[PDB]
């Protein structure tokens, strides 16, 4: 069965290292591990790379619109390649997790995330797969929506790559063996 891997992020230099943007960093480093380079997908506005993990082929997407409009290219991809929800996975920052910690799941809710609740409302349906990447957020009740669009501290910048070298190593196991083999291995800490 054909195979779909996200990440969400917004688009833009000023954006590329915030943490709502982590997303669209793991999708690269994938791309990079399989030697892939992103390119415009006419279809759905998205842009795409293609490649194999342990010999099994998978499209690589991150989409091109605001966070709040990615369901309208990730669903048009999903129809394009022909790929069941179930066999989506979107790769996300987390609010709910603390920063590093790293989840696997199908279904469940979307921890606050715009561009989650987007793409549940493109696809019909809550069971897509979903590696998700904890960065906090502030404490009470505050509003995050302005935490997730600033970049990461200095101190965080010290683990934000080993934390994406994590979460690539995640997406391949969750597509090489299944999502409760992929949490026996990654729930790390």
């Known amino acids: 069965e054909p195979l779909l891997v996200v990440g969400l992020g917004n688009p833009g230099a000023n954006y590329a290292r915030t ?20 390119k415009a997908h006419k279809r ?15 499209v690589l997407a991150k989409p091109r619109c605001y966070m709040n409009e990615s369901g309208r290219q990730i669903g ?5 390649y022909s790929v069941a929800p179930a066999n989506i996975i979107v790769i996300h920052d ?3 997790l603390e920063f590093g910690r790293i989840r ?4 469940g809710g979307e921890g606050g995330h715009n561009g989650l609740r987007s793409v549940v ?3 019909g349906t809550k069971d897509f797969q ?35 070298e994590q979460a690539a190593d995640a997406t391949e196991l969750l597509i090489e063996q299944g999502m409760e083999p992929a949490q026996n291995r990654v729930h790390a800490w």
């Open 121 to 123: 409302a493109a696809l």
């Open 104 to 107: 696997l799941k199908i279904g």
């Open 94 to 96: 987390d609010l709910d």
């Open 19 to 38: 943490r709502h943007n982590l997303g669209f960093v793991v999708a690269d480093l994938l791309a990079a591990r399989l030697g892939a380079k992103f």
């Open 76 to 80: 048009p991809l999903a129809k394009f």
């Open 130 to 164: 979903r590696v998700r990447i904890g960065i906090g957020r502030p404490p009470g009740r505050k509003d995050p929506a302005a935490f997730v669009l600033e970049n990461f501290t200095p101190a965080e910048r010290a683990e934000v790559p080993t934390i994406c």
């Open 44 to 58: 759905s506005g998205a842009e795409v790379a293609t490649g194999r993990s342990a010999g099994r082929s998978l």
